[PDB]
């Protein structure tokens, strides 16, 4: 997260870190047994770390649970990063408490201009903001018109742009798979973008409200 602010510790209780001996992607807990992330973050086996704030300091609030199954959306495409979403089933249910909680899945898409929050342990491009501590950023959903202006022929109906066209604030590498929550509902998954925080290069996110049908069916 570039140009954001350190999240209040555990305020994004749904935020999890996908680990394989190190942090490589973010994710969102949606139930005691399931985590939603980006399909391009796929790995057959993943160690899901919940209740984290500083990923390199044992805080006593963490839960480390290995995946039992990792499932990419059936229509995911590694060519255009279409339908970039996947589910991770935990080998054992996570315990919900003050530091670990699931975020609601959407049943209603959000309108353009809606203010949301994106978070992650990704690059900050700064020494002032330590990416090892969960970073937060308030950002508005951008119109498809602006998205298509910025990324000609790359934006599908399962994607949406969010951020600042003037640049300076944006999600970044390492934030991938992470959450974009709007009014307490998970509306996006950090997917891709051209560089980070660059003018006219807003972040592109998987549109969960269009992909939630698949998520719900797979969880049941």
Closest CA to 29 of 17, 42, 11: 17
Who's near 35: CB < 8 A, 6+ residues apart? Answer: 16, 27, 28, 29, 48, 87, 88, 90
Region binding Ca ion by CB under 5 A among candidate stretches 53-61, 75-83, 162-170, 184-192: 53-61
49 makes contact with Na ion (CB under 5 A): no
53 φ, ψ to 5°? Answer: -130, -60
Region binding Ca ion by CB under 5 A among candidate stretches 32-40, 59-67, 170-178, 195-203: 59-67
Q: Tell me if 42 sits within 8 A of 137, measured CB to CB.
A: no
Structure letter (DSSP) for residue 90: E
Active site residue 176: yes
State how far the Cα of 40 lies from the Cα of 114, in Å rounded to an integer. Answer: 26
Region binding Na ion by CB under 5 A among candidate stretches 4-12, 13-21, 67-75, 210-218: 67-75
Q: Which is nearer to Na ion, 53 or 72 (CB)?
A: 72
CB of 57 to Ca ion, least distance (A): 5
72 makes contact with Na ion (CB under 5 A): yes
59 makes contact with Ca ion (CB under 5 A): yes
Out of 10, 17, 84, 171, pick the active-site residue: 84
Selection from Ca ion, Na ion, none that 59 binds (CB < 5 to 8 A by kind) is Ca ion
- Our CA angle for 2, 58, 138, nearest 5°, is 25
- In this structure, the number of other CB atoms found within 10 A of the CB of residue 107 comes to 10
Q: Would you mind telling me the total number of residues written for the chain in this entry?
A: 220
Out of 23, 40, 53, 201, pick the active-site residue: 40
Active site residue 40: yes
Q: In what order do the strands lie in the sheet with 185-192?
A: 5-6, 135-140, 115-120, 179-182, 185-192, 203-207, 159-162
Q: CB nearest Ca ion: which residue?
A: 59
CB of 191 to Na ion, least distance (A): 17
Number of residues lying near Na ion (CB under 5 A): 1
Write out the binding residues for Ca ion, residues 66-105 only, by CB under 5 A.
none
CB of 42 to Na ion, least distance (A): 7
CB of 87 to Na ion, least distance (A): 10
Active site residue 84: yes
Residue in this structure with the two tokens 């807003």, named with its chain if needed: 202
Q: Just list the catalytic residues.
A: 40, 84, 176
Residues in the site for Na ion, rule: CB under 5 A? Answer: 72
């Amino acid at each position: 997260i570039v140009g954001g602010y350190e999240c209040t510790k555990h305020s994004q209780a749904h935020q999890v870190s996908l680990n394989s001996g190190y942090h490589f992607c973010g994710g969102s807990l949606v139930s005691k047994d399931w985590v939603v992330s980006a399909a391009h973050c796929y790995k057959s086996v993943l160690r899901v770390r919940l209740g984290e704030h500083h990923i390199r300091v044992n805080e006593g609030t963490e839960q480390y649970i290995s995946s039992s199954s990792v499932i990419r959306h059936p229509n995911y495409s590694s060519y255009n990063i279409n339908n970039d979403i996947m589910l991770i089933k935990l080998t054992k249910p996570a315990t919900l408490n003050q530091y670990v909680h699931a975020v609601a899945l959407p049943t209603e898409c959000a309108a353009d201009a809606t203010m949301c929050t994106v978070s992650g342990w990704g690059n900050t491009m700064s020494s002032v903001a330590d990416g090892d501590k969960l970073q937060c950023l308030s950002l508005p959903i951008l119109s498809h018109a602006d998205c298509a202006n910025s990324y000609p022929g790359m934006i599908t109906q399962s994607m949406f742009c969010a951020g600042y066209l003037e640049g300076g604030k944006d999600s970044c590498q390492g934030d991938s798979g992470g959450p974009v929550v709007c009014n307490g509902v998970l509306q996006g998954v950090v997917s891709w973008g051209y560089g980070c925080a660059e003018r006219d290069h807003p972040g592109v996110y998987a549109k969960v409200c269009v992909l939630s049908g698949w998520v719900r069916d797979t969880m049941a």
